[PDB]
Each structure stands twice: as C-alpha cells, then as structure tokens.
From a paper:
The TEC family kinase, BTK (Bruton’s tyrosine kinase) is best known as the target of ibrutinib (IMBRUVICA), the first-in-class covalent kinase active site inhibitor used to treat chronic lymphocytic leukemia, mantle cell lymphoma, Waldenström’s macroglobulinemia, and chronic graft-versus-host disease. The TEC and SRC kinases share the SH3–SH2–kinase domain arrangement (the ‘Src module’). Membrane-induced dimerization activates BTK and we present here a crystal structure of an activation loop swapped BTK kinase domain dimer that likely represents the conformational state leading to trans-autophosphorylation. Together, these data provide the first structural elucidation of full-length BTK and allow a deeper understanding of allosteric control over the BTK kinase domain during distinct stages of activation.
With the stabilized full-length BTK mutant showing low activity and a more compact conformational ensemble in solution, we built a full-length BTK construct for crystallization screens that incorporated the 4P1F mutations and the ITK loop. The resulting construct, referred to as full-length BTK with stabilized core (FL BTKsc), provided diffraction quality crystals (5–7 days at 4°C) both in the apo form and in the presence of various active site inhibitors. Despite efforts to stabilize the autoinhibited form, the electron density derived from crystals of full-length BTK (FL BTKsc) defines the same domain swapped dimer observed for the previously solved structure of the BTK SH3–SH2–kinase fragment. Notably, there is no PHTH domain density visible even after the structure is fully refined. The result shows the crystal is full-length BTK protein with no evidence of smaller BTK fragments. The crystallography results are consistent with a flexible N-terminal PHTH domain with the caveat that crystal packing might limit native autoinhibitory contacts between the PHTH and SH3–SH2–kinase regions.
Author numbering:
A (entry chain A), B (entry chain A): 214 to 299, 302 to 309, 314 to 322, 325 to 659
The structure:
Amino acid sequence: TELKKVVALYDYMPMNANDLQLRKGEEYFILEESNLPWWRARDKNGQEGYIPSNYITEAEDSIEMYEWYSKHMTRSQAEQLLKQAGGGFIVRDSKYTVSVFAKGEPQGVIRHYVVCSTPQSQYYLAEKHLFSTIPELINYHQHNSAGLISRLKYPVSKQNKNPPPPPGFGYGSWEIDPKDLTFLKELGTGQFGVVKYGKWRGQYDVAIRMIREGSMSEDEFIEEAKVMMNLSHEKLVQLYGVCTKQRPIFIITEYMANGCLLNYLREMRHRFQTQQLLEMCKDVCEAMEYLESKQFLHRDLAARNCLVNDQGVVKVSDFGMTRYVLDDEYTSSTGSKFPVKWASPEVLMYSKFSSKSDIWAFGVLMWEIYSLGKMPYERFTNSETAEHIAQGLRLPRPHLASERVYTIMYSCWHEKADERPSFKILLSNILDVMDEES
Amino acid sequence: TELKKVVALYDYMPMNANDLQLRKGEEYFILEESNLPWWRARDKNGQEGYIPSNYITEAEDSIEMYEWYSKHMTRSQAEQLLKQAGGGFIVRDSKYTVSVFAKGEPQGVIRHYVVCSTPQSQYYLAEKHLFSTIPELINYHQHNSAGLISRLKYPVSKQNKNPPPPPGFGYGSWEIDPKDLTFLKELGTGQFGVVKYGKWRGQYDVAIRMIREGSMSEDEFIEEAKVMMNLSHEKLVQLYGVCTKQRPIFIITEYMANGCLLNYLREMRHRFQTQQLLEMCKDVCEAMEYLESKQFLHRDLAARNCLVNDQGVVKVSDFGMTRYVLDDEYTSSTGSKFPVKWASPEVLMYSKFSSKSDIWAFGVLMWEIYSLGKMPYERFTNSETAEHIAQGLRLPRPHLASERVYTIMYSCWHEKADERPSFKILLSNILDVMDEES
Ligand SMILES: C[C@H]1CN(C2COC2)CCN1c1ccc(Nc2cc(-c3ccnc(N4CCn5c(cc6c5CC(C)(C)C6)C4=O)c3CO)cn(C)c2=O)nc1
Ligand SMILES: C[C@H]1CN(C2COC2)CCN1c1ccc(Nc2cc(-c3ccnc(N4CCn5c(cc6c5CC(C)(C)C6)C4=O)c3CO)cn(C)c2=O)nc1
C-alpha cells in the first residue's frame, strides 16, 4: 500500500540488536505505523529495524527539520536570543512569526514580523515595502517579482501624442491677422454670424467665427476680449484671437471636428458607447470647475453649447457670450428664444443667475447626455415647466442612467440654490462613480 | 526668494519674439508665477522668455512626466489598450492603479493592481507573494528585501541541542539490569520507597526509584508495567524500565535535576521569573493532553507530583501510580493523607474520578503555580473545603495571575463535570494567552 517516510531529527546508535541507527539528515521510510513509541523503518542503505518515534519528522513536518522554526520560541524569548546573537532571521510558532535584528545603530532593534496564512493553504506576510516614491516602486517591480503577474518592465504608452491647444497663437497676440487666416470650408452658422474652419498661417487648424450685423456688441466684446482670452483649460475651447481690424470681426477659436455634442449624441451614435457618456460628463464638469475657479459663469450650458473633437473629448464653448447678444427674444427671461429648458428657478423668476444656476444647467446637461439628446420636458411648455419645477417635479431618470448618476444630477437640481453642490465636489463624485463603474 | 522649476511636457517653437523654445525633457526654471496662461521662465542655456503653462510639469508632477501614469486611463480602457498591446505595466489615476498583461496562455489575462497610499505619505500595493511553502518564502526573503529590516540570511539557531529521553533504554528492554545501574547520589524518599540518581551503563543519566516493603503492589505494577512503559511524551517523565529480578524492584526513570516543581517555586525562586510560570502551565497541559489522548488518568496531579529539569521545563510524573498504593489513609477518599486540596467534588463525594477530576486538579495546579506554591485553602480544613466547593466558592486569583488565566483555571473548576473543558482546548487557550502576553 502507501509508503511513509520521515527525516532523521537526531542521530541514534542502536543500544539493542532490534534497533536501527538513525543519522540526522538521513531520511528513513517507516515500514509500519502504530501508537507505540518505537516503529520499524528502513534506510536507503537497505537496513531495517525499530527506531524511536521521537526522532522522526513527517514530510510536511520539514518546518521542524529546518534550523529556523522554533515552536518554543516566543515574542520575548526570541528577542532575548536575537539580542545576544546581535539581522538574525529566526522563525517561531504562533500561524507563525519571524524575528530579525537590526545592525551604526548600536541600540539593537528587533522586529516581530508575523506570517499570515491564506485561506487557500498559501502563506504570506503582512508587510509592505512602503515605497515613498511611485517611480521608485515602479523601478523596484521593474527589477523584481513582488508577487506580480510579471515584472513592471514593459511600459504601456502611445505614440499618438498631440500637443495641447496653444493658449493663443502667440504671446500677447490678441489680434489675429486675416491674411494669416486660411479659410477652408464652412462649419454652419451661429447665433451671431457664420462659422468656417480655416488654418492660421496655413499650419494651425483654427475655426473662424465671423459675426453678423447687429448680432453682438462688438465694443463690449473687444473690451472683455482680453479677459475671455485669459480663460484657458483642457476641457475648454481655446480662443486663439480676434481679428477686429476687419469687419465682421473674426473670432478665431479652437477647431472641433465633431461639432456640437448635442448633434453628436443625436446623429453620430455610431462612434461612442454607453460607457463613455460618463467620461463626457466628467469633461464638462472639469470645464465647469475651472470656469468656476475663475469666477466666470457659462450662463448658457447645454449639449448644444458643447463641442467634440476627433479624439471624442467634449469641451465647453461660447463661455459667457450671452453678455454680447442683441436678440431680445433670447436675452430676456420671458423671451421666446430663451432656454427655459435649462434655466433655473431663480433665473426664470427674478433673473438671479449664478454659479448655482450654472450647476442646474450642468445637471440638465448630464440628464440630456444620458438621454442621448432628448429634449428636456418634451411634452411640457415654457410655463408648465416652471410650474412643475416649483411644485417639486424633476426630470426623470434616463434608461441608461444608474441611480447614482441620477442622484448626482438630481442634487444638481436642489430647490435651494445655496444647497446646490459645487463643481469641485461634483467632479469628485463623478470620478468616484467612474472608478466604481470601471 | 524661492525658485520654481518644471519639466518640459512637450516641445514648443516660439511663434512670437516674446516666447521661449520648450523642448521635451529640458527643465526650465519659472521666473514668475501668475494665473495667466503664459509665464516667463529661464533655460539652462541661459535664455529666458514667456512659455505656455500647458507645457510645464511641477517637480512633484513628475508622475505625469513619466511614460506610464495616465490619469485618463480607466479600469476598462486600460485593459483594452493592454490587450491590443499584447506584460505591459501601465499606471493610471484612481490613489492610483496599475495594469499588467499575461503572456503559452494565448487567452490574454489582465490584472488591475491598485496602488495604496500610507497615511504617512508613503505608497505600497495590496499584493502578497502568496508563497505556498514556508521555506520557499524564507529563501525568497533570504535573497530579497521585501520591505524587511534585512534579508533573511542569518539563521538564529542554538548549539545546545540535546537528544530527547530514549523511550526506554532499548527496544523491548523492559527489564533493566541492576549491574548496569550506576548509583551515584540520593534524591530523597518517596511515598513507596527511596529514590537515588544513578547512571544506566554509566553513560545514561537515570533516576532509580527503589520501592519500600509493603508500600506498593509489585505484582499489579509489573502487570501494567508494559502499559505505563507505552506512555511517552516530551512533557512526561520517561520511564526507562524496571529491575524486577532484584528486591526492592527498581523503577529506573528519567532524571530531573530541579526535582519537584512545588519546591522549585517555593525555594528555587532565584532561577525563574513571573513570565515563565505560564510556560510551565503550558508544559503541564501538554502532558495532560497526551495522557488524555491515551485514555490514561494522572489521578494525582499537583506541583508536588511534577518535576523540573536543568533546562527549566516541567514534566508530570508518577502518572497513575495510585493504583499501586498500600497506604489506606492515602487511597481512601476519607483518609488523612488523601489530597482533598486538589480533589474534586464528585471524587470527594462518591469517588467517581475521571478526566474531569484530572482537569479540576490541573486547574488547582495552575492556581498554585501562579501562587508561587501557596497551599490551596491554607485557612480551611478538609471538611470546610468541601463545604465551600459545594456552596460555590472557588480559589481566589493570585496576585500575579491575569483575569484571563484566572478565567481559565476557573473554567477548570466547573461544578458540572460534563461542562469542564478538555485539555486540548485548555492548551489552545493557554497558547492564545501566551501569544497575547508575548
Ligand atoms: C458635424 C459636422 C457634420 N458635417 C456634415 C456631415 O457631412 C456634412 C458638416 C459639419 N459638421 C460640423 C463639423 C465641425 C463642427 N465644429 C465647430 C462648430 C462651431 C459652430 C458652428 C455653428 N454654430 C455654432 N454656434 C452655436 C452656439 N452659439 C453660437 C453663438 C452663441 C451660441 C449660444 C449663445 C447664446 C451663447 C451665443 C455659435 O456660434 C458653433 C459654435 O461656435 C464652432 N467651432 C469652433 C467648431 O469647431 N461643427 C459642425
Ligand atoms: C532539589 C534538590 C535540592 N538538593 C539540595 C540542595 O542542596 C541539596 C537535594 C536534591 N534535590 C533534588 C534534586 C533532584 C530531584 N529530582 C527527582 C526527584 C524524585 C523524587 C524524589 C523523592 N520523592 C519522590 N516522590 C514524590 C511523589 N510520589 C512518589 C510516589 C508517589 C508519589 C505520589 C503518589 C501518591 C502517586 C505515589 C515519589 O516517589 C520523587 C518523584 O518520584 C524522582 N526523580 C526521578 C527525580 O529526578 N529531586 C530533588
């Protein structure tokens, strides 16, 4: 049947003819197993005989066969023998513990590192390398195992690295030269004029926005043009400059290939997925957090007022351009072209726009992003919408929105403006839910 | 004042005379810090000028300066770029996470190892090497750091290794030869005869126990001598043999230098400390657990009935010798020499000794060990002791005993015998409290 084998704990010289000579380190195969103190075994040389049971070590008992494990050693005695030894690695039972000495530093320092046991029969240690430097840890794992699937010696970078939008086509270059502008095609028309994609110096992809007669207050616009030019963020359209010497003054800004994210979600639904609109909302929230840090108010925040580039990243645009609108039906709170769908309570009532109103509009933007572009309150009217917002009604939950993101965009719509979240904490929560989704 | 410096995220060619040429990798010292998008810096070559803020990386921002960290990377996109890369170490923000690929095994396997942040500004990873072999882990740490005070390459062993007691002076050697016995000195007198320390064959330290006339039932003793010889344990005195051919029959057993632990704790109080009596109790409990596994009953368990050797380890002795006593005053339950102090309720009442009675006696032994040898119920008498044990009284807590060990030795004294603990769980609890003390 099955055969048993043990190691020679110590060495024994047969005091009796019926005994076998044990020799420390020479494994012996037990021939019979009983409860008596002596059992018959056989040696590699071929001799067999009875031998003491107090001299055998089971195959799995190799722990005792080693010169480190010491079941008798405790967390105190071990430190007393490690101080007299004066770094000695000594193992003791406790499912075990290890002790090492510290060597400079004459005051001996002892550590009691405990050995933990995995539920899957494995063993490890509750100790972390504690790298105070991330690249130092990356280099360590690069030249070590550390229980990883492989060494961290295969960087995962990309070659599609494009510089960011130049904060203006040159320092102090507020006035663009129409001669440099290289009009190429047309990008549609805007509230104040017509757009067209060209190239500054024929080497920088710019989007020229020519104005319409009696559409914007060019004077005030140029007055605050330096201000609006000082606004620069990754998720923010980069205003390159303005050609004011020529009429209509040309607002040369960053170019976005996909155009309005609203149409991107309502027509270009064959280029993204349901797991990316959250990243779009993160981009929008980052832009809003920046413009809030700048004490600037978007004033008009909506998918229509956001653009998307070839890389698929969404960025806010037309930041704070309302102040330079001439259409009364759009500027007035009771006008027809006024976006009541995204407007807020205090706005619609007393015209008290604020960062809280921008947060309300951002919540509406998240709702429509998750709705794929469906218009808010498609069934209601400009007055019924205010009625329902006052009564307490809120936009429903899109079929693709989780309860978490719905709670986010709902907190964005708190009746009390002073209670509405800030864009910073909104971005924090969006990042949290993103890390959870992923 | 203080000087600032950053790294060149990308490379920039001055489109304007007021600009400075940025070159990826060339650190630049920012001359002035503002909120504008362009700031003036100076280069190592000595040239200074305005440069974009979107191209600078703070010194602590080196994370982005590396080609691994990717704040945009998520737990999904990262796995999509790692599968197309097909083990690539890619870091992303999340306070961070790392991803590596698996290479054999054509079905790509990706891991999402998260990077943890210590409260002390350090960084580590929630990953264990998971060594399924203790000596394999010891070898790994022996040739690695693993965040240890030092490599596990300094064994902490001792040269004072003595073989254990030979389970008898030879196999089947039940009858010792008085000629071999080498009587040396005297060790005192016992209940049945007189003792003396000698040497078997002049080479094995043995303790001969010569019997007294009309003190023991030599016939029954020799009858069960093979049985009592089959009892062998580390914390158990090792009966070497019996010379029955000569009168008085000499019980040659293991020699213990310190003698009775009772006198060891009552006179030899200049060789141990208050942190070792717990180990003594552990030794006694191990012996009791073994003799319980053997369905053998000590019958008389007490510090007096335990010996100690030069190494300071205590071992039980005279295991089950009561059956071979001739003194009626000691055998009878109502006799004068009967140890009522250690006796149990059922014993004193109906004479129903059992493993529960042995557990009671072991609790009493622990109490007296922690009392330094004080006699149990020094004020009471044989009858008042039973009175108080029946009423519910129990031995008090020695000044050196913690509430935990007191609860242990108190559970040892449960009124209901069927409820008294087992020696196995008692040893488990003693080991637990020992690891806690240490
Ligand atoms: C999507 C493709 C589809 N393609 C079809 C498919 O085969 C042909 C045609 C092209 N089309 C396309 C591509 C790219 C772009 N990109 C860009 C659009 C615009 C743009 C265009 C028209 N109106 C506007 N708006 C709309 C908002 N708004 C304006 C002014 C004001 C507002 C609100 C206000 C009240 C604050 C005032 C305003 O100007 C804008 C945004 O400035 C600006 N910039 C810089 C671009 O890069 N757009 C569209
Ligand atoms: C401590 C030093 C001090 N030293 C002084 C200091 O300067 C001089 C003198 C020596 N002394 C000393 C040293 C070593 C030893 N060791 C040994 C003691 C004994 C021993 C001695 C006397 N009585 C007994 N008992 C006592 C218990 N018991 C006996 C028989 C029975 C019992 C109970 C019963 C009812 C079941 C029956 C019985 O025999 C024993 C235990 O067997 C046996 N063995 C094997 C030893 O190795 N003892 C004493």
